[PDB]
Amino acid sequence: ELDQLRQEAEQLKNQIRDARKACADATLSQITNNIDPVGRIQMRTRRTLRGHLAKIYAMHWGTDSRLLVSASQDGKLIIWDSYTTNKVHAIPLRSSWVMTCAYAPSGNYVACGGLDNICSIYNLKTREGNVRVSRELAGHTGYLSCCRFLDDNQIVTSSGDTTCALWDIETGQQTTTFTGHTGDVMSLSLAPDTRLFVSGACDASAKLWDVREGMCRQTFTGHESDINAICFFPNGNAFATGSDDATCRLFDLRADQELMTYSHDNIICGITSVSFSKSGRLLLAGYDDFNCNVWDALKADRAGVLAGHDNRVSCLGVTDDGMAVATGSWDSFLKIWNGSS
Amino acid sequence: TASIAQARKLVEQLKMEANIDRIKVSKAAADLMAYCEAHAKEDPLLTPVPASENPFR
Amino acid sequence: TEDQRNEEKAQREANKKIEKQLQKDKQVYRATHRLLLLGADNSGKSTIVKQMRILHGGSSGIFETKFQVDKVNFHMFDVGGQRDERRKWIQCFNDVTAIIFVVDSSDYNRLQEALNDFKSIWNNRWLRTISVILFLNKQDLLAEKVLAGKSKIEDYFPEFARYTTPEDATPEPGEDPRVTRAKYFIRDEFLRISTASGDGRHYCYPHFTCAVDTQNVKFVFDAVTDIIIKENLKDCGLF
Amino acid sequence: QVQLQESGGGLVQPGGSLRLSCAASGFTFSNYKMNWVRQAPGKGLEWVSDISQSGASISYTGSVKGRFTISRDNAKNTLYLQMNSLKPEDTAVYYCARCPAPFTRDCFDVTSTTYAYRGQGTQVTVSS
Amino acid sequence: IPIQLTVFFMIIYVLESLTIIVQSSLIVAVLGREWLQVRRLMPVDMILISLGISRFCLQWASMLNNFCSYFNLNYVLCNLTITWEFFNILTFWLNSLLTVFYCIKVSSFTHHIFLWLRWRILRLFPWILLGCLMITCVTIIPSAIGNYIQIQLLTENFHQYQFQAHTVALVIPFILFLASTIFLMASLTKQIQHHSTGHCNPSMKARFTALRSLAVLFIVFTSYFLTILITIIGTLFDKRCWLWVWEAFVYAFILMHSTSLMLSSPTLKR
Ligand SMILES: OCc1ccccc1O[C@@H]1O[C@H](CO)[C@@H](O)[C@H](O)[C@H]1O
C-alpha cells in the first residue's frame, strides 16, 4: 500500500526530472555569453530614512513609486515619502513583532503581520485623520511572513503554518487556502497579471499557485536550503529566489527548470530579500553580511555592491518605475539608492 | 490511513505537475533576453536617468 | 505655487508631530527590558509568567506581560502560537535584553533535549549578543527524586559519578549533599555549554528557581541590571 | 532537490553492531553540519549525534556516548553512524537530519515534527 | 641644578613629547579612518578625537614655547601662550564631559529628574561637545584681554587679575570632572558590594576594571591640574632654572593620561 504510493511518487519525480532534462538544451549562460555585459553600476544613497526605534523587518513600495511603508520590531508601521524624506503616518502596532508589510496598489490600505498570526489591515483614507485598524484577519496557525495586496479587497498572506491564504478583507475569511509546502513559507510575489503567485518556503522549494483556482501548478527545487526571498520577473514567466544557502536562483515557469544560479565563493551569508529591476536585467539581493549585491540576471555577474548598512539587510524593494531601490536593514534605517549618469 | 491519504495527495500533485507543457530552455533564454533588451531603455537603474528627471537627486 | 508651499508646510507639521510621538515612544521603549521566555512544555514557563503577572500589575499567539519592579519596566513574552520550527521566528529576538531559559531539572529524559536547545540558542548567529538567565526549575521535585526512588542520573548523563560538588556551592542549610550534587551537575552542564563558546559576547546567569516568587523576580532584576551594566561599560569602553 | 536517503538497520540481537549510511544528494555535503536523530516507538524525536563540516566538532548524547561513532565521508557525500553494543532502548527509526543552513554551528529545526532536511530513516529493532 | 642634569631632563621631555605626538597622530589617524569608513562613532570617540586634537595642538604649543624660551633663540614666533591656554582649557573641559559621560551611561540611580537629565545629555551629545569649545572661547576672554593688556603695558596692580583669572578659567571644568568622577566611583563602588552576593564574577571583573581605571584617569589628570595650578601660582618654582624639570614632570603626566585614554578608546581595539 504505502510502499506502492511511495514508489509511484518516486517514479513521477523521476519522470518530471527526465522531462526537465529533455527541455534543457542550451543554458541561459551560453545564450547570453555574446550579449554586452551590464557593466559596473554604482548606486549612491540619495535618502536615508530614520525614525525607527528597532530593526526594520519588511518594507513595500507604493504604486506611486514615491510612498513606502516600513515595519519595525518596536511595533511601528511608518509610511515614508521618499521625495521629501518625511513621515506621513506612524501607526502603532498592537503586537510589536511584525515581519511582513504590504501597501495596497490604490494606496488606501496597508497591511502588517507577524508572530501574532494576524493580518492587520489599516485604512489610510479614513473619515478622520487617524489611521485605524480596518480589519484583523485571523485564522493562520503560524507567524505571518509576507502579505501582498491584490485588488484592495483580497489579500494573499504566506505564513509559518506551511500554508498560504487568499483572504476576503470585507468578509474576513479564507477565500482560498494554498497547501503543499513542507516548511515555513517566507516569501511571496504576485504576478503582474494577479492570476498567479509564487511562494518560497523553508522546504527548499518554490511553488506556483493559481489564485482563482487554488492549486499548485509548478514546484521548483534547486536550492539546498530554505528560501527567504522571492520575486517575479517583470515578464511574468520567471522568478528569482534567494536562500540561506548563499545563492540566488532564476527559475522559468514555462520550462519548469532553473536557468541560472547567481552565487559566489566569497558569499557565505544567506539571502534575505530579492527584487528585479524595471527591465529584469538587474537582480538586487540583500544579504546577512550587511551588504546588497546587484547581479546581472542574464550573466551571473556581480554588477554592483550596495554597502551602507551596519546590520543585516532585511528587505529591499525596487519602485514600480525603477527609479530607485530602497533597502531596509536591522540598523533601524532605510536607504534609497539610485544611479547617476 | 492518514499517511496513505497524504501520500495520495502528494502523488496527485506530482501527476498534475508532470503532465504539463514545458517549453525548451533555449526559447526561455531567448524570451528573457528579448524582454531585457526591449525595456533596457526604460530601466533607470540599468541606464541612470539624468539629474533633471531624477526625483531622488 | 502657494498651494504647494502650504502642502509642504502641512507635511512638515505632520512629520514634527510624528517625531515627537516617536521620541515619547523611544522614552517608553528604551526604559523597558524585553525578556524572552524560552523552554519546553514540562518547564513551568507558563507558571512563571502567570506568577509574575499576578505579583505585579501585569497586562493564542504570544503571551505578553508588562510589569514594574523598583520603577523599572519589564516586558516578558512567551511564544506559544507557533510550530516546532524556530529557526526563523527566533530571529525576531536578536535585540532582546535577556532570554529567560526555563529548564525542568526534575525530568532527566528531556534534560538532554533541554541541553541541546540551550546549545542551539547559545550558538545562534542572531543570539550571540543575548545573555541567558538560566531558570533551573522544579527544584523541589529534583530534591524528592534524588532523595529516594533510585532514579539514577547516570543512565542519561554517565558523568555524574565522575563529578564532585563545587567548593563554591553555597547550598541551602538543609540540603542533602546528594541534591546539591545533582543540581550543581545540571547547572554545570548548562554552564559548560555556555562557556564553550561566546563567553565574551554574552553570559549565562544560573538560578535555582521554584523558590519563593520574590526570589525569582529579584534574580531576574539583578541579572537584567548587570546585563545593562556590561552593555553600557562596553559602550563606554571601561571594560 | 535535497535528498538524504538512509540505509542499514534491521533486526539485531543485543550487543551487536550496525552501520547506518545516509547517502546525501542535491546539496554540497561539506558545507553542512549533520546530525543523526532517532525516534523510538511511542516517543518524540531525540538527537543522537552530530558532525561538523569536516569532523572537528563531534558530539553525542549521553545515552549513546562510547557506543556509537559517527563519521562523514565528504567525497562520497555520505554520513555513517556505527552502532556498537546495542541495547533494546535503541529500537528506533533513525534519520540523518541536515542542519538547515550552511556554514554555521546552530541547528534548530532538527528533531522537529516536520523537518524538510531529513530522510525517511531506517528501523533498528534491537530485540531477541 | 647641574647642566648635565638639565640636558638629561630635556632629553626625557623631548622623548616624552615625541611619543605623545606619535600617539595623538595614531589616534587621529585611526579615528579618521573610521570617519571615512561610515562616520559611525559612539559618543566616547567624540571626545577622544577632541582630546586627541586638543592634546596635539597643546603638545605642539609646548614645543614652540620651551625652546623659544629655554634656548631663547627665535624669541618672537614662539610666544604662543594664549593658544596653549585655550587648548588646555579645551582639555580640561572635554575630560569633564568625558567624565560626565561616564557618570550618565553607567548610572543606576533612577531619580526622575536624573533620568530626564540623563536622556537630555545623551540626546544632544554633539551639541554639548560643541559647547565646550565655545565655553572655551567664553573662558579665555580675560586672558586674551589680559595678555593684550600686559603686552601693551610692556610696550601687582592689574596683573593680579590675570593671576587669579587664569585659574577661574579651569577650576569649573575640574569641579565638574571631580564631581562626576566621585559620583561614578561611588556609584560604582556601591554597586560593587551590593551585587557581591549575586556571585556574578563577570560583573565583578567588569566593574573592577573600570573603577580602577577611573582611579587612574582621576589620578593622572588631577595631578596635572595641580601641575597647572602650581605653574599659574608660580612661586615655588623656577621654570627657567627647572623649566625642563617641570616639563618633564608635567608632560610625563600627560603621557599617562593619553596612554590611558589611548588604550581606552574602544574602536581602536576593533
Ligand atoms: O603662563 C601661561 C600659562 C597659564 C596657565 C597655564 C599654562 C601656562 O603656560 C604653560 O605652562 C606650562 C607649564 O608646564 C608649560 O609647559 C607650557 O609650555 C606653557 O604654555
Coordinates of N, CA, C and O and ligand atoms in Angstrom, one line a residue, chain E residues 13 58 61-66 69 80-85 88 143 166-167 170 224 227-229 231-232 239 243 246-247 250-251, ligand 1:
Chain E
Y13 N 62.1 64.9 28.4 CA 60.9 65.6 27.9 C 60.7 65.5 26.4 O 59.6 65.4 25.9
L58 N 48.1 71.3 21.9 CA 48.9 71.7 23.1 C 50.2 71.2 23.0 O 51.2 71.9 23.2
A61 N 52.1 73.5 20.8 CA 52.3 74.8 21.5 C 53.4 74.7 22.6 O 54.2 75.6 22.8
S62 N 53.5 73.5 23.1 CA 54.5 73.4 24.2 C 55.8 73.5 23.6 O 56.6 74.2 24.0
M63 N 56.1 72.8 22.5 CA 57.4 72.8 21.9 C 57.9 74.1 21.3 O 59.0 74.4 21.2
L64 N 56.9 74.9 20.8 CA 57.2 76.2 20.3 C 57.6 77.1 21.4 O 58.5 77.9 21.3
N65 N 57.0 76.9 22.6 CA 57.4 77.6 23.7 C 58.6 77.3 24.4 O 59.4 78.2 24.7
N66 N 58.9 76.0 24.7 CA 60.0 75.7 25.5 C 61.3 76.1 24.9 O 62.1 76.8 25.6
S69 N 62.0 79.5 24.7 CA 62.3 80.1 26.0 C 63.6 79.7 26.6 O 64.4 80.5 26.9
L80 N 53.7 81.5 22.1 CA 52.4 81.1 21.9 C 51.6 80.7 23.1 O 51.2 79.5 23.3
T81 N 51.6 81.6 24.1 CA 51.0 81.2 25.4 C 49.4 81.1 25.3 O 48.9 80.2 25.9
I82 N 48.8 82.0 24.5 CA 47.3 82.0 24.5 C 46.8 80.7 23.9 O 45.8 80.2 24.4
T83 N 47.3 80.2 22.8 CA 46.8 79.0 22.2 C 47.0 77.8 23.1 O 46.2 76.9 23.2
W84 N 48.1 77.8 23.9 CA 48.3 76.7 24.8 C 47.3 76.7 25.9 O 46.7 75.7 26.3
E85 N 47.0 77.9 26.5 CA 46.0 78.0 27.5 C 44.6 77.6 27.0 O 43.8 76.9 27.6
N88 N 44.5 73.8 26.5 CA 44.4 73.2 27.8 C 43.0 73.3 28.4 O 42.5 72.3 29.0
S143 N 41.9 86.3 29.8 CA 43.3 86.1 29.5 C 43.5 86.6 28.2 O 44.6 87.1 28.0
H166 N 43.4 83.3 35.5 CA 43.8 82.1 34.8 C 43.2 80.9 35.4 O 43.0 79.9 34.8
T167 N 43.1 80.8 36.7 CA 42.5 79.8 37.4 C 41.1 79.6 37.2 O 40.6 78.5 37.2
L170 N 40.0 77.3 34.5 CA 40.0 75.9 34.5 C 39.5 75.2 35.8 O 39.4 74.0 35.9
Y224 N 47.9 66.7 37.2 CA 48.2 67.7 36.2 C 47.5 68.9 36.4 O 47.8 69.9 35.7
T227 N 49.6 70.4 38.6 CA 50.7 70.9 37.9 C 50.4 72.3 37.3 O 51.2 73.3 37.4
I228 N 49.3 72.4 36.6 CA 48.9 73.7 36.0 C 48.6 74.7 37.1 O 49.0 75.9 36.9
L229 N 48.1 74.4 38.2 CA 47.8 75.3 39.3 C 49.2 75.8 39.9 O 49.3 77.0 40.1
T231 N 51.9 76.0 38.2 CA 52.5 76.8 37.2 C 51.9 78.2 37.2 O 52.6 79.2 37.0
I232 N 50.6 78.3 37.4 CA 49.9 79.6 37.5 C 50.4 80.3 38.7 O 50.7 81.5 38.6
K239 N 60.8 77.7 36.5 CA 60.9 77.0 35.2 C 62.3 77.4 34.7 O 63.2 76.6 34.6
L243 N 62.4 74.5 34.4 CA 61.9 74.5 33.1 C 61.7 73.2 32.7 O 60.6 72.6 32.9
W246 N 60.1 71.0 35.0 CA 58.7 70.8 35.1 C 58.4 70.1 33.9 O 57.6 69.1 33.9
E247 N 58.8 70.6 32.8 CA 58.5 70.0 31.5 C 58.4 68.6 31.5 O 57.5 68.0 31.0
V250 N 55.4 67.5 34.0 CA 54.1 67.8 33.6 C 53.5 67.1 32.4 O 52.3 66.8 32.4
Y251 N 54.4 66.8 31.5 CA 54.0 66.0 30.3 C 54.2 64.5 30.4 O 53.6 63.8 29.6
Ligands
LIG1 O1 51.9 81.2 31.8 C1 50.9 80.9 30.8 C2 50.1 79.7 31.3 C3 49.0 79.9 32.1 C4 48.2 78.8 32.5 C5 48.6 77.5 32.2 C6 49.8 77.3 31.4 C7 50.5 78.4 31.0 O2 51.6 78.2 30.2 C8 52.1 76.9 30.1 O3 52.7 76.4 31.2 C9 53.2 75.0 31.1 C10 53.7 74.7 32.5 O4 54.3 73.3 32.5 C11 54.2 74.9 30.0 O5 54.6 73.6 29.9 C12 53.6 75.5 28.7 O6 54.6 75.5 27.7 C13 53.1 76.9 28.9 O7 52.5 77.4 27.7

